[PDB]
Each structure stands twice: as C-alpha cells, then as structure tokens.
Amino acid sequence: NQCPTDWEAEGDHCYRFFNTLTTWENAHHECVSYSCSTLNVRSDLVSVHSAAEQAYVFNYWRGIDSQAGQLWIGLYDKYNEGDFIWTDGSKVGYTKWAGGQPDNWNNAEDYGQFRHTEGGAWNDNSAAAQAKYMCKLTFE
Amino acid sequence: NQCPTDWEAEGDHCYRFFNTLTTWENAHHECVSYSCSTLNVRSDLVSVHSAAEQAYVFNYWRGIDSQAGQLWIGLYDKYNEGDFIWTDGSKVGYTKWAGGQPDNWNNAEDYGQFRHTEGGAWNDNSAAAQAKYMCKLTFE
Ligand SMILES: [Ca+2]
Ligand SMILES: [Ca+2]
Ligand SMILES: [Ca+2]
Ligand SMILES: [Ca+2]
Ligand SMILES: [Ca+2]
Ligand SMILES: [Ca+2]
C-alpha cells in the first residue's frame, strides 16, 4: 500500500470518499486539486471499469455513509448530449444505468452519480443537484 | 503497487535510483523537488531503517549501476557533529557503518553514503564528493 494517507488502495489506484454534499462541478475541481505533476499523478472524479470496481467504490462509500443520497462520479455528457464519457479520459466500457436512466430530464442532466440503492446504479443529474463524491488517483 | 511511474514499490514506500554523479546537497535538493503537498507526499533522500531496507536499496542500486562508486543517502551531521540524523525527519535506529566510520575525515565529512562494497556499508564523506543517489517517497 503505497497510497497517500486518507486514501484507500485497490489495484493500481487510490480512492478517497468525501462525505460532503456539493455540486458535480465543485466535486470535479476538488478531486482534480489532489493531482501531483512531479509524480505524474492525476487525481479525478472516480471512473468505473468493471463490476468489481463498481462494487469496491459502492462498498467503500456505503461503508462510511449511512445517509440516503447519491455519489458523484466522473461520468458526463456535457460536450455531446447522450454520449457519456469519463473526465479522466479512460474508455467507456462499463455502465450500470438504473432503470429509466439516463433520461436527460428537463434537458439539463449531464452528470453521472451512483444511487445509494441497487449496488450503486447510475443516474444522470443536473448541475444544481448535490451529492457526495469520490476521487481516484491514476499514476500515469 | 500504487507507486508513481518510474518509482519502485517496497513496503509503505516508493524508491527511485538516479544514475548521475552529483554532490550530496544537489542530490538532496533533487529528491525533495519531487515532493507533493497536495497529497502530503514527501520525496527525500533515502532513509534506511532495517537490514531488509538496506538490502533492498543496495540491490536496487547495484542491479542498475555496475560502476565502482557510492550512493548518497539522507544521513548527515551538519547540525550536530557525530549525531547523524535523517533529512526526512525519521529517527535513526538501524546503522551499518563500515569499519572506521564515521570518521569525519579532515574535520570535513558530514554526509552519508553507501559504498558499492560489503552490502553497502556506510561512509561519511564531504560536500565536494560526488556519488549517485536514491530518493524515497514517504506518505505523510
Ligand atoms: Ca446536455
Ligand atoms: Ca445529458
Ligand atoms: Ca436522470
Ligand atoms: Ca561537521
Ligand atoms: Ca561529520
Ligand atoms: Ca569517512
């Protein structure tokens, strides 16, 4: 375990859950703010690439947080409506959409989040909504 | 393994060997310049706290550098002559002083280094000496 203190290790990554309500854009900035250019470490909202990473992220979050609510992740379609990508540039092979999602409700939902139910099934929500958030380190 | 690219993982630490002759002070300045305050990651010259870390560092160095020569470590007695301290603030427990060391030769040796001989036994040397160096990450 070579993760920074207050960050959890799993695979080739470190993860850290922030138990504070905020907007997706603010969460994005807060995660990116933990980057370290001298060590080529890129910090970002969590990206999710397998059922096992989903489960990991979900169980880490719900292991700390007992409140009903959502968890921002780095999935978004801001720049191309309908095409959800990761902020960290990683490829989009894994999805876990909740039934009826993504629905771009009121033509204003471009930001992805886990629900606290159904193993962390994903919803698209808006720039005004608030949720907790999870950051991930990528050692480039 | 959660070490940055080009750093080697061992225990709770990451290490990196630089195959470049330089002074201790420059080596120290170089290692520290990799530090990252956003993740509380100290980069510094290597500190050695067991025979196991000693062997790990020695074999890592010698697996790359087959030249006769020395490797700077973060041990120095500039402030208090004869009382060596680690630049990373960790306490000195383990030592592996070569016979007849540390001798403060010519009243002018404040800086610790492995020799390439005898499993990397330590010598103190001066501010004008040149050696290769190794950095270490500490997750503070
Ligand atoms: Ca849109
Ligand atoms: Ca949308
Ligand atoms: Ca929705
Ligand atoms: Ca002295
Ligand atoms: Ca001395
Ligand atoms: Ca000496």
Automatic annotation (TrEMBL), chains A, B:
Gene3D superfamilies attached to this UniProt entry: Mannose-Binding Protein A, subunit A (3.10.100.10)
Record has Nucleotide-binding as a keyword: no
Keywords, sorted A to Z: Calcium, Metal-binding
Disulfide bonds: 3-14, 31-135
Binding site for N-acetyl-alpha-D-galactosamine: 101, 115, 123
Molecular function via GO: metal ion binding
Span of domain C-type lectin: 10-136
Protein residues bound to N-acetyl-D-galactosamine: 101, 103, 109, 115, 123
Keyword Heme carried by entry: no
Binding positions (Ca(2+) 2): 103, 109, 123-124
Residues that coordinate or bind Ca(2+) 1: 77, 81, 104, 109-110
Name this protein carries in UniProt: Lectin CEL-I, N-acetyl-D-galactosamine-specific C-type
Organism of derivation: Pseudocnus echinatus (Sea cucumber)
Lineage of origin: Eukaryota, Metazoa, Echinodermata, Eleutherozoa, Echinozoa
